[PDB]
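Sample 3 of the quickstart, ligand 2-phenoxyethanoic acid:
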Amino acid sequence: VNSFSGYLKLTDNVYIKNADIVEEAKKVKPTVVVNAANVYLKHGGGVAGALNKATNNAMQVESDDYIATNGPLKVGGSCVLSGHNLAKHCLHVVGPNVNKGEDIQLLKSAYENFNQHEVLLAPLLSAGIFGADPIHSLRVCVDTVRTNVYLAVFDKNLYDKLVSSFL
Ligand SMILES: O=C(O)COc1ccccc1
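Result:
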């Protein structure tokens, strides 16, 4: 049993809800919240800007020190950092940004990072401001992630479309 409430069950392991991932993290304090990161961990907007704002910029301060030490992530890669006031840990995952020309085949690699964690609160990777088709992102999630994932969809309209179109 876990703390997640009000999710629709899509599969054995994938669950979905219309929710503000920031508000959901604050309420649940999950072991892992996923950030929709970029390779530079520059948390300007979308999920990353909202998560970082909720940490009062502590996420960006930690991220800048991580990049200064390690250099940028790979598209499709991840790193584990603090979850600050939102979660135990933040898994920063870089999905391909279609609005930068990145290969959408990298979306499967991105979601494979989730399998290193038994339970996660996450957004749909490469969805929203990253420019991918969210219906596609949900299909790759379902077909890739084997661990238990709780998906927070920001757009209420999009949530209903994702549910109503799900195979
Ligand atoms: O709903 C999400 O989580 C990402 O996709 C969006 C679609 C429309 C507007 C904002 C986000």
